[PDB]
Design a binder for this molecule. Structure first.
Ligand code: HEC
Ligand code: HEM
Ligand code: HEM
Ligand code: HEM
Ligand code: HEM
Ligand code: FES
Lengths: 164, 62, 241, 379, 43, 78, 379, 55, 37
């Protein structure tokens, strides 16, 4: 009984190996093609947005905001009592250089693009359901649960920031 | 007397189909790894230095 | 209706089922395309993704891809402020658009090399025997200057300038740049470029070949056991009386 | 038998489920929605195949493509608007179908009710993907918000949403995928519908009275083929009335604007057939709680067979359940209203109560009412 | 083939032609709407 | 596997029917229809009447209230 | 019965055509092509749906799109080269299928034979449109010259070629049509397959001996499930051997060149499956004569039932047909060769005698041979 | 009896007229477009090319 | 009450489920689950 069963048993393992591999290939394709490399973590801007006017860039199908802040905006963001924020963060925990705030321009409620310089905090206002964000990208009012997302970024020489 | 290797294997793992299946799951796992390892090795041997794996040195970290 | 000469099964590292691509060749070849060939032929589906394929680092190819965007850059694509940096950009189109391209080469239209080894019937053999094949027009033959005579073109005449000639370029290492030696490397970069999946496929094929063979052997044995009873059985007719 | 065409070919016998089959006599007009449901699938299909004869599935073109289908192509305008309006019908019809088996105890046919449920949720996915094909503002943002709603799952979610999209946003990748799945789901659905009919042919159709009609059975051919044809007549009437006099009316979305990924209609919402679910989703503060609750709205359906408490599979002879039944439909109507409403106090507070009233009606009220009624009859 | 042919069968064929004949007319009518011959329209 | 000869057992029931060509599609349709349609509707309306009334009332309240909050805010604070 | 899973669900009983069915004992390896036939239909489909998950159906992009599937998309390369190669297999398998039917007289099952035939031709359409999706030089031209070959019809033709194309040439309009019909044919074909299976289930599988086996019947589950799995194993083998080691080998066409409507590969020809069809058209001077004879190539299948002359449905015992059966097959190979041949004297004259040989073998030789053998056996 | 048959016949005619139009509409969209068919039959060009070549 | 009737299955049932769950993951080879062994 053992010998006959073993051949079938050995055979079963072989189908599973290939089967697992074969199944993975079809699944893999939907998940990754050019994907993130083609559209993920790549950006470069600075010249387009200036004088306190936020600039939006297409990065991975989503708006990437690079906003040049004024000292007044920086000061106002400094004077916020984090302890009373729904998603408590100090402005300095969200930026590397105060005059520059870089954010994923996607409302954390349901994905719309917040409008810069609108709302009750001079930051952003999301028109879809009324979420108000401050100039730090922090959610101050409305249904959004989180502050706008801060991506990974670095500043190279020759005035440039690399996001991703 | 002792049970042939098969008989041993049989009574421990193939009587119950639960065990049997468990085996096969396990086996499928173990097997995939060895196969690959061995079968990849074999294939890289046949193309020594022909493949980037061999050739990364040249322009890597100085 | 002119006889067409056909390509040798030129000795390639990869001719064989398990044989794989020789990246150094790729590498070399690349440059050949980039210096010898980027001028009139394009490679649209090829990005600046040699990295691992061509052993050029990410920093290596980034840099290599940066200068190509600095000189030919996205100003030819339509990116006004574009300069060095980007890696998603595809090899730079010799000319704005096809029609131009024919003008530069007088009516002819430089075929996109992306798929040429695969694209031209006869594979990298033909491509190598074309470039390396250039002989003297045949007694009693006439040739318009553009119509250079080539021993391997369908119509027995091609609009191709000195494809490759000795010492056309120079490689980093020091590979002796012979007309042919360079062709051997140029083809290879084309073959790798033409069938990126194929290079991966050969390695996979070896794995597939062993698994299939092992699976087939067990199945024949497994199959035999299930069907053994019918085969083993002998039925003897019994007389009614 | 000899020369009895029907049973001669084996294949032709299989078709005598239309002509010879035992059909209950008494039988509300409601039943005509099964047949109509299948007319809708066939309509959608022919339309789709002609639309997908002149559509393209790319960011750049899609919009244009649809726009070209409605302008330069001959009779593509009606084909497209017939298409769009059709799907409304397809849903209007589906929700009559479910109401009739919620009322009359048709769901007693467990097997058949679980295929229905599969059917309903397959048709839901197709309608979700087909609306984005055009690639208009509404479509674009709707598929972002819904898909991303999936990213509420804690461990996987996030990775998974990105697999489905085939990237970090909704660019080409995602739009071609929808085109492919939209085209192949209705063909898979057709086999399920026939598997549905299969099971249902083993026990025949229930009635108003809720009692077996084996004592009074009619040939489908003589009677029901005319009724069905007549029901088509009206069905098409509504389709064409819609598609010819008020093309857009029932297609709430006015967004004939090419999608701009920074731009947003502050009023983002699925079409009418999805509103219920939408409203139920917003009632929950927490994202994940909403998604589960969203699922349960729809998936809740398979539980009704277990929930049945009464001894009369027919609601027909039971007052109290008739009263809650209707409320739930009107609660349902209430919830659809919230779907097109600003998400502000007034609507919030309403929706929330509606959402609890829906689950109550299904999960607790009716069940009890079933018992009571049984005890009043002394059963 | 040979079996089908018969001396007896003729009445059925005659009957078939009328039904067949009537059927044939319908196609011309059916085809004509789709065909839209200017001459057909002229008729 | 047969659906017509196997449904159920029925004894002692006589049924009388008439051919389509001998009768009218509608016999006294206006007279018969008004009564039955009217009688059936009243019962149906009552059972389903409760669901309809609540929806109408809530919709009116919601539209008004949502609009009302949006409508005035400046007057309240000064 | 109680808790006999199989007949409990009615649905699951319908699946006992695989497990419990009477299957003849004796049975060449040839019959595994039925099953594999299905295998291929399912593989193309899974493959198709993923490719059509990243493909676009426009002039501009289509070439790019395929090119992008094979480059940037993860495991898109194998999926596509698996899909191309598959279709080869699919046909290689088809032509084993019909060979077997030709040789052992499985075609006696007239109703099954007629479905087969429809099957064959439906796939044939499929393959013709898919190859054009990628919109490359071979595809582009091949569609023109085939489609135009329809303009042979005298009265209509001309108008009709223009309707099929959606214009005067083969621009976008045609290209999206093929995308849509390619997509929907295979689904329709699956219905057919099952219908085909249905009819065949009513008389079971013929044998090499040619006699009923009812006196020898075997479990399909025990025996024929392993055979079929084994069959797969070899089938896949061939499909990966092709796809992994020689991706392009069997795909004669090297035209990876974006289609330029003024340009032409003087050597225009259909693929291996359609190679025979192209050759048939060539032997006749006249256009129309060639289209009729092309149709008759394929359409001549449904005659063979009526042509059958012998008393032994099994060719197995009749030498002479075994010889002319093989020759037809080798004549068929000969014709396939012509397909990739310059249309010049050498090939012309050959093809013409091969096209007469094929129709003789099928129309006249075999049928006579049948008789003869019957008379030598004294039958 | 004749009246009954006539009533049935009348219904069919109404359906057929609608059916012809509906069927025709489906067929018409597939056959041609005024996109394509705008460019058809409309072509001119001259005097821009050599007194010698072929464009 | 119910457990006693199914106690034999419970032990046997328990073994099959663990094997099945582990095997699918093992064939599946999800990285997070595996990391632990
Ligand atoms: C100076 C411009 C130029 C350069 C550099 C050049 N080609 Fe070409 N090539 C052409 C033109 C023009 C044609 C068109 C030939 C014809 O149509 O007769 C051509 C044709 C070809 C063909 C002929 C295929 C066919 O049958 O039409 C091949 C192969 C080819 N090029 C490959 C290459 C490769 C490989 C290189 C680099 C190693 C290269 N070419 C370099 C201009 C160029
Ligand atoms: C019953 C199942 C189906 C449903 C519910 C459905 C629904 C839809 C919807 C709601 C849209 C959006 C149209 C708009 O608002 O502009 C659409 C578009 C589309 N559908 Fe379908 N459809 C179904 C079946 C099919 C089938 C079978 C095909 C093809 C065979 C198809 C092909 C298309 C195409 C190509 C489009 C895009 C062009 C357009 O926008 O009309 N659909 N579908
Ligand atoms: C694609 C959508 C659907 C189609 C095409 C379809 C088709 C049909 C048809 C033709 C019938 C027979 C006539 C009738 O009773 O109306 C029927 C009955 C039935 N369907 Fe549907 N169906 C669909 C969706 C559903 C859904 C969404 C459900 C419930 C979840 C469902 C459950 C039932 C039940 C329970 C019956 C039997 C009721 C009875 O006659 O007593 N079906 N279906
Ligand atoms: C047996 C039925 C089918 C056959 C014979 C078949 C055959 C083909 C062939 C020969 C090509 C040309 C590929 C090339 O050489 O580049 C192709 C392409 C294509 N087919 Fe299929 N196919 C079938 C079913 C399907 C299905 C069901 C789908 C969609 C679900 C599909 C989608 C595609 C797509 C998108 C392409 C274009 C890109 C490419 O070239 O790969 N096909 N098909
Ligand atoms: C879509 C393509 C097809 C599929 C998937 C398919 C599948 C099958 C399978 C799985 C079998 C049973 C095993 C066997 O005898 O080889 C079978 C048998 C059969 N097929 Fe097909 N088939 C196809 C095409 C055709 C065509 C084109 C015809 C003829 C015009 C045909 C006629 C038959 C016949 C006559 C048999 C029964 C033979 C016998 O065992 O006596 N098939 N088919
Ligand atoms: S996206 Fe919902 S409030 Fe901004």
């Amino acid at each position: 009984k053992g010998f006959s069963y073993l051949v079938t048993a050995t055979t079963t393992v072989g189908v599973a190996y290939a089967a697992k591999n074969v199944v993975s290939q079809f699944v893999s394709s939907m998940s990754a093609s050019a994907d993130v490399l083609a559209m993920s973590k790549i950006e470069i801007k600075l010249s387009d947005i200036p004088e306190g006017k936020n600039m939006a860039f297409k990065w991975r199908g989503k708006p990437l905001f690079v906003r040049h802040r004024t000292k007044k905006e920086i000061d106002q963001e400094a004077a916020v009592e984090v302890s009373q924020l729904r998603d408590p963060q100090h402005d300095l925990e969200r930026v590397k250089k105060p005059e520059w705030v870089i954010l994923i321009g996607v409302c954390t409620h349901l994905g719309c693009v917040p409008i810069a310089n609108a709302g009750d905090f001079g930051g952003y206002y999301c028109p879809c359901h009324g979420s108000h964000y401050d100039a730090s990208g922090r959610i101050r009012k409305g249904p959004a649960p989180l502050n706008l997302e801060v991506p990974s970024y670095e500043f190279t020489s020759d005035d440039m920031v690399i996001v991703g | 007397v002792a049970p042939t290797l098969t008989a041993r294997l049989y009574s421990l793992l193939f009587r119950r189909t639960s065990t049997f299946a468990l085996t096969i799951v396990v086996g499928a796992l173990f097997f995939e790894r060895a196969f690959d390892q061995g079968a990849d090795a074999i294939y890289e041997h046949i193309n020594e230095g022909k493949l980037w794996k061999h050739i990364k040195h040249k322009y890597e970290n100085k | 209706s002119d006889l067409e000469l056909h390509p040798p099964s030129y000795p390639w590292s990869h001719r064989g089922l398990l044989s794989s691509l020789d990246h150094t060749s790729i590498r070399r070849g690349f440059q050949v395309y980039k210096q010898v060939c980027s001028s009139c032929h394009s490679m649209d589906y090829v990005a600046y993704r040699h990295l691992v394929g061509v052993c050029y680092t990410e920093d290596e190819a980034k840099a290599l891809a940066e200068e190509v965007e600095v000189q030919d850059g996205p100003n030819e694509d339509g990116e006004m402020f574009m300069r060095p940096g980007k890696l998603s950009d595809y090899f730079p189109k010799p000319y704005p658009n096809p029609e131009a391209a024919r003008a530069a080469n007088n009516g002819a239209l430089p075929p996109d090399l992306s798929y040429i080894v695969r694209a031209r019937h006869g594979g990298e053999d033909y491509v190598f025997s074309l470039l390396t094949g250039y002989c003297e027009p045949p007694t009693g033959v006439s040739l318009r200057e553009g119509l250079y005579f080539n021993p391997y073109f369908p119509g027995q005449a091609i609009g191709m300038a000195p494809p490759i000639y000795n010492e056309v370029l120079e490689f980093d290492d020091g590979t002796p740049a012979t007309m042919s030696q360079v062709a051997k490397d140029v083809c290879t970069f084309l073959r790798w470029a033409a069938e990126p999946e194929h290079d991966h496929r050969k390695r996979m094929g070896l794995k597939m070949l062993l698994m299939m063979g092992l699976l087939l052997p067990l199945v024949y044995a497994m199959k035999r056991h299930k069907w053994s009873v019918l085969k083993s059985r002998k039925l003897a007719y019994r007389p009614p009386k | 038998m000899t020369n009895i065409r029907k049973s001669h070919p084996l294949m032709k016998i299989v078709n005598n489920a239309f002509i010879d089959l035992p059909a209950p006599s008494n039988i509300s007009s409601w039943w005509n929605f099964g047949s109509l449901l299948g007319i809708c699938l066939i309509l959608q299909i022919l339309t789709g195949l002609f639309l997908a004869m002149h559509y393209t599935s790319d960011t750049t073109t899609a919009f244009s493509s649809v726009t070209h289908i409605c302008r330069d192509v001959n009779y593509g305008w009606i084909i497209r608007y017939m298409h769009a309006n059709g799907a409304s019908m397809f849903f209007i019809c589906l929700y009559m179908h479910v109401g009739r088996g919620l009322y009359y105890g048709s769901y007693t046919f467990l097997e058949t009710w679980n295929i229905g449920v599969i059917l309903l949720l397959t048709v839901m996915a197709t309608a979700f993907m087909g609306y984005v094909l055009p690639w208009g503002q509404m479509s674009f943002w709707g598929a972002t918000v819904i898909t991303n709603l999936l990213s509420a799952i804690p461990y996987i979610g996030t990775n998974l949403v990105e697999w489905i999209w085939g990237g970090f946003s909704v660019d080409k990748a995602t739009l071609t995928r929808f085109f492919a799945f939209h085209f192949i789901l209705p063909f898979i659905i057709m086999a399920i519908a026939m598997v549905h009919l299969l099971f249902l042919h083993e026990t025949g159709s229930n009635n108003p009275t809720g009692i077996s009609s084996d004592v009074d059975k009619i040939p489908f051919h003589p009677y029901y083929t005319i009724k069905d044809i007549l029901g088509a007549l009206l069905l098409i009437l509504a389709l064409m009335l819609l598609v010819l006099f008020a093309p857009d009316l029932l297609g709430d979305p006015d967004n004939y604007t090419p999608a701009n990924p920074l731009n947003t209609p502050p009023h983002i919402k699925p079409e009418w057939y999805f509103l219920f679910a939408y409203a139920i989703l917003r009632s929950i503060p927490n994202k994940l709680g909403g998604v589960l609750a969203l699922a349960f709205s729809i998936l809740i359906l398979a539980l009704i067979p277990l929930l049945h408490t009464s001894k009369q599979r027919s609601m027909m002879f039971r007052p109290l359940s008739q009263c809650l039944f209707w409320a739930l439909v009107a609660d349902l109507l209430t919830l659809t209203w919230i779907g097109g409403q600003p998400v502000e106090h007034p609507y919030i507070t309403i929706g929330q109560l509606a959402s609890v009233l829906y689950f109550l009606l299904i999960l607790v009220l009716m069940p009890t009412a079933g018992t009571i009624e049984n005890k009043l009859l002394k059963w | 083939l040979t079996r089908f042919l018969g001396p007896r069968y003729r009445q059925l064929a005659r009957n078939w032609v009328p039904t067949a004949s009537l059927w044939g007319a319908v196609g011309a009518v059916g085809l004509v709407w789709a065909t839209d011959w200017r001459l057909i329209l002229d008729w | 596997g047969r659906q017509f000869g196997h449904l159920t057992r029925v004894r002692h029931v006589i049924t009388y029917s008439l051919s389509p060509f001998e009768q009218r599609a509608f016999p006294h349709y206006f007279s018969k229809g008004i009564p039955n349609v009217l009688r059936r509707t009243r019962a149906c309306i009552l059972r389903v009447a409760p669901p309809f009334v609540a929806f109408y009332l809530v919709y009116t309240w919601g539209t008004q209230e949502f609009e009302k909050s949006k409508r005035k805010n400046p007057a309240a604070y000064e």
